[PDB]
Amino acid sequence: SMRKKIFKPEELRQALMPTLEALYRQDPESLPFRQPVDPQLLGIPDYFDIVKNPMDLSTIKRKLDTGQYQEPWQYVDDVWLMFNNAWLYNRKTSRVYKFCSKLAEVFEQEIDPVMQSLG
């Protein structure tokens, strides 16, 4: 055992950053996820009425760079928050929804062997 394993920030960064890079490499699918949503600039002013906890790729990257994840599952939770936000907000025919579904397929594939490596 019950002694909690400690993960050091550079260990998490080396292990998890490639999985984030794999999401960035999806193009066009990552393009709507690369920056924080600005609802007025994007023409979606209802966004924060629906999505209470925004998350995007640039924020996840900054959190890894600044040691804000103590456990790999906290990083997984933010990636999944980003996915769940987009499945909640967008209509099922929209680009962002279908792009989200593809990013979730890619992330599932990438994160699995990394979680095995971290344990």
Name which of 19 and 90 has its Cβ closer to ligand A1IKI. Answer: 90
Of these, 21, 42, 45, 66, which contacts ligand A1IKI (CB under 6 A)?
A: 42
Q: Report the C-alpha gap between 40 and 85 in whole angstroms.
A: 17
Name which of 28 and 119 has its Cβ closer to ligand A1IKI. Answer: 28
Q: Is 32 in the site for ligand A1IKI (CB under 6 A)?
A: yes
Q: Which amino acid is at 49?
A: D
x/- map, 73-102, ligand A1IKI, by CB under 6 A: -------------x--xx----xx------
Q: Report the C-alpha gap between 16 and 18 in whole angstroms.
A: 6
Name which of 12 and 86 has its Cβ closer to ligand A1IKI. Answer: 86
Q: Report the C-alpha gap between 51 and 29 in whole angstroms.
A: 20
Cβ contacts of residue 17 below 8 Å, gap of 6+? Answer: 61, 64
Q: Which residue is nearest to ligand A1IKI (CB)?
A: 32
The tokens describing 70, both together, are 């103590």
Is-contact 19 111, C-beta < 8 A? yes
Binding site for ligand A1IKI (CB under 6 A): 28, 31-33, 37, 42, 44, 86, 89-90, 95-96
